[PDB]
Design a protein around this ligand. Structure first.
Ligand SMILES: Nc1ncnc2c1ncn2[C@@H]1O[C@H](COP(=O)(O)OP(=O)(O)CP(=O)(O)O)[C@@H](O)[C@H]1O
Ligand SMILES: Nc1ncnc2c1ncn2[C@@H]1O[C@H](COP(=O)(O)OP(=O)(O)CP(=O)(O)O)[C@@H](O)[C@H]1O
Ligand SMILES: N[C@@H](CCCC[NH3+])C(=O)O
Ligand SMILES: N[C@@H](CCCC[NH3+])C(=O)O
Ligand SMILES: [Mg+2]
Ligand SMILES: [Mg+2]
Ligand SMILES: [Mg+2]
Ligand SMILES: [Mg+2]
Ligand SMILES: [Mg+2]
Ligand SMILES: [Mg+2]
Lengths: 485, 485
């Protein structure tokens, strides 16, 4: 209770004492090894070996634990690579350091140590310190679950599992780039500020550029710009960056999230299906050591093909009582839709209602890797029409763990059709659809110059990271998730 | 004049004819080679060799040029890797293709070809087509300088030099990551939407999050979040992403630009100076093949140390007539400042005026790689104070080609000092400084838990790319620069 305030008072008083002595906050100590390096290299050597090698190293980190036993102590130092034990002895350090300094320090304090490696009777790798310094005084003692999000640094200091989650996220992004580049893809960068937002359907964030007295939009998707690059000649491009959607927070929704969009000319959605399967198998194998991944109560085998269902087969499979003929009739579909809780807006058509039904009915049950094809043209304004049935498109979305992970399709490279579809989106917007697309004249012009047959894929990176770190809330894979006021 | 509209009419009419025949826009052709691959591998083989090897390949791209000579033609195909010549002959292709299809195509059209490699009497690598298809009909013929920016796809189709500029940008970013990772740095991702913007001084873009009825800011810098990660334990992190500043457009300013911020604990600004020099020498050598880089009328040798000057030495060197004692006196400095065109605001102090003078006086003359040290504390609220003189900080900025490229310093890990400095920024904001920092309580708290001595660096990526692609306007290295309405 009050013992905490005594901790705050004592650390502050110790700091004041540091200031009277000299520079309380130096920046002079330099280390040459991190704990993980020392371990990877010397964990297999016995004390006899280490005695002869007589390796002196320098490390620095946070004092996590400390057991003072008179003239000698044991300290656990935590750094970027993990933890390493220090053997701090009064007679090994310069006169007075052990008693006048070391013993006056506190857990949480950042310290630097230089000394010889050896192993304790316990067999643990440790450093016999010949030099020890206080680099940074911690004014606060070492540390619902929203606290972990409101002060991620504390979450990272305290929980090894949180740290590993984020290190795996980095390993995954690096592996994705290596994977993409090995396939001749080039990473580009398009605008995050757009005069005309597009490439998806969502409520956007609006801002104002003072210099140009112009209203701008945070991008909801880089699609329209990436395909312009394909027209220009960069036939294998990809971008990995944020998208911003003015929607609410959820266990699978952050208003700003990371997405990877890729485009490859002379390919169709089938080529995206193989690329996607190959990417997951690679990430699992390369990052987790195996293709069988445990996620909650399930196990995904990324060494096996994903399941493939059409949107209608998915509705029928997860709501078997459904009279499928209902979906081929607006009045019947509207009724079906509303009967399950969907508020059918007046701008919606058959294809939109069916997609909404699929979302409500099947989405959550797609636990094992699954591709859902045959997305209606009405909800896919930028996708290539199906050769046989124009009302559906060469589009698919894939799901894992009951969540939408990606969205990919054979791109629409028919400028006249693109214009019409943009017009329909504009009519819809005028009819109430506040998420409908804006008409983009320049995009249509780019298409008029000629876009090669192309296939594009969009994968939610945050959601994909959940599946590889066994996280069940997107907030567990985003360092600083959007917090409610 | 009207011949252009005849081109538009003719392509549109040819398309209509395509639609009557079947699917005007197929997505079925697949290639197995890009021009650069064919060249890298077969440019050194003579026709006798290629005759025996009898290599059949498949390519696809834009028809750039075409010379029809009766029953045979020569075509130049442009793809992601460059150009390759095709030898299209009536008797090599299936009956009627050459005459009924090929000859009716137009430049700009996207085509696919399959055939055997060989070399022309000219010695150029070419493909003897056995199959040729029209993949995408171009409805528009092949293509101030703002047009290149308003329709970058045309700029990319037309100019090989623009394409190479962007390919080098990608090569550079990839090399930076490889460089950072080899040094144990981990790439993270912090928020682009912030409730309290900070980490720099600039007018920010403001937006509104509907769900939380909250006003948000596009980030001007990721600094405050990256250092929180250092407190948490990620001692070697970096981020490469956009920053948004609500300022005007210039030859060195885009309202949204790419920046790389890196932080390494147990290091000071000197370590950043070596890292910076090492990074440029590496990029030049690895990406351009040499450390001597030509930029306009100059040559930068990245194999040689950068120049180092204090902010005051730079002012004296580029305005020798200046009585330096003036800079140590507010009234005299204000006068000096105003006499050279600087409007001194009422919230400014000596350190701010001096920095402004440096900007006006020396900045533009720093052509060769130069580090400018001793930035005043007043304009560096997050930098470590100088041990000897508290009024200046362990901060530097480096310039090349007369432009600021980077900004780095020994981080301020003194929470009490950080709070005071934030308070001063708040007073300044209240005194008119619309670019002053916001007070961030949580950031100070993070510091209270303890930030290790650290060094952080911020490099403007767009500006750095200019120096490596001989570009003299930032708009030449950003695929889609901010265009005036
Ligand atoms: N708010 C958000 N937070 C995180 N990822 C998101 C997101 N909104 C969309 N995504 C991701 O972007 C991908 C492509 O965007 P899309 O337009 O398909 O989103 P969506 O609205 O269908 C996702 P959901 O169906 O879960 O609401 C999604 O498959 C998902 O991976
Ligand atoms: N509008 C802009 N466009 C492009 N790069 C920019 C930029 N504003 C700043 N930068 C880059 O970010 C770096 C760090 O930000 P900083 O706060 O130092 O900018 P600044 O305002 O000093 C740049 P200048 O002095 O050219 O106006 C700069 O050194 C520069 O490389
Ligand atoms: N832009 C899409 C992802 C890529 C679609 C394929 N071209 C989205 O945000 O859903
Ligand atoms: N945040 C700084 C760059 C890094 C400064 C070093 N900590 C800027 O925008 O200028
Ligand atoms: Mg959504
Ligand atoms: Mg969805
Ligand atoms: Mg979707
Ligand atoms: Mg500026
Ligand atoms: Mg400046
Ligand atoms: Mg600056």
């Amino acid at each position: 209770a009050i013992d905490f305030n005594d901790e705050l008072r004592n650390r502050r008083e110790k700091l004041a004492a540091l200031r009277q002595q000299g520079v309380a906050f130096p920046n002079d100590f330099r280390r040459d090894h991190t704990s993980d390096q020392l371990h990877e290299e010397f964990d297999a050597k016995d004390n006899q070996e280490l005695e002869s090698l007589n390796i002196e190293v320098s490390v620095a980190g946070r004092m996590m634990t400390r057991r003072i036993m008179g003239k000698a102590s044991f300290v656990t130092l935590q750094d970027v690579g993990g933890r390493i034990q220090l053997y701090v002895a009064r007679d090994s350090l310069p006169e007075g350091v052990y008693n006048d300094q070391f013993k006056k320090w506190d857990l949480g304090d950042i310290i630097g140590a230089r000394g010889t490696l050896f192993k304790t009777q316990t067999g643990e790798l440790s450093i016999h310190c010949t030099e020890l310094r206080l680099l940074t005084k911690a004014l606060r003692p070492l540390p619902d679950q929203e606290v972990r999000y409101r002060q991620r640094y504390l979450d990272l200091i305290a929980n090894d599992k949180s740290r590993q989650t984020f290190v795996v996220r980095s390993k995954i992004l690096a592996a994705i780039r290596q994977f993409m580049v090995a396939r001749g893809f080039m990473e580009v960068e398009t605008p995050m500020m757009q005069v005309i937002p597009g490439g998806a359907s969502a409520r956007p964030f609006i801002t104002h550029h003072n210099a140009l007295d112009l209203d701008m939009y945070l991008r909801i998707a880089p699609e329209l710009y990436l395909k312009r690059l394909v027209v220009g000649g960069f036939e294998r491009v990809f971008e990995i960056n944020r998208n911003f959607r003015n929607e609410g927070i959820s266990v699978r929704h952050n208003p700003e999230f990371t997405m990877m969009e890729l485009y490859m000319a002379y390919a169709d959605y089938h080529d995206l299906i193989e690329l996607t399967e190959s990417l997951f198998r690679t990430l699992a194998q390369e990052v987790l050591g195996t293709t069988k991944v445990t996620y909650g109560e399930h196990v995904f085998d990324f060494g096996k093909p994903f399941e493939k269902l059409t949107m209608r087969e998915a509705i029928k499979k997860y709501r078997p009582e459904t009279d499928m003929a209902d979906l081929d009739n607006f009045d019947a579909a509207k009724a079906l839709a509303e009967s399950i809780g969907i508020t059918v807006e007046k701008s919606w058509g058959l294809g939109r209602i069916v997609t909404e039904i699929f979302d409500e009915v099947a989405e959550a049950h797609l636990i094992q890797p699954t591709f859902i094809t045959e997305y209606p043209a009405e909800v896919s304004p930028l996708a290539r029409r199906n050769d046989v049935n124009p009302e559906i498109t060469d589009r698919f979305e894939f799901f894992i763990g009951g969540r939408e992970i990606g969205n990919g399709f054979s791109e629409l490279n028919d400028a006249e059709d693109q214009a019409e579809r943009f017009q329909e989106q504009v009519n819809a917007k005028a009819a109430g659809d506040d998420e409908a697309m804006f008409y983009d004249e320049d995009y249509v012009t780019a298409l008029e110059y000629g876009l090669p047959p192309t296939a594009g894929l969009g994968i939610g990176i945050d959601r994909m990271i959940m599946l590889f770190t066994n996280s069940h809330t997107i907030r567990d894979v985003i360092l600083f998730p959007a917090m409610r006021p």
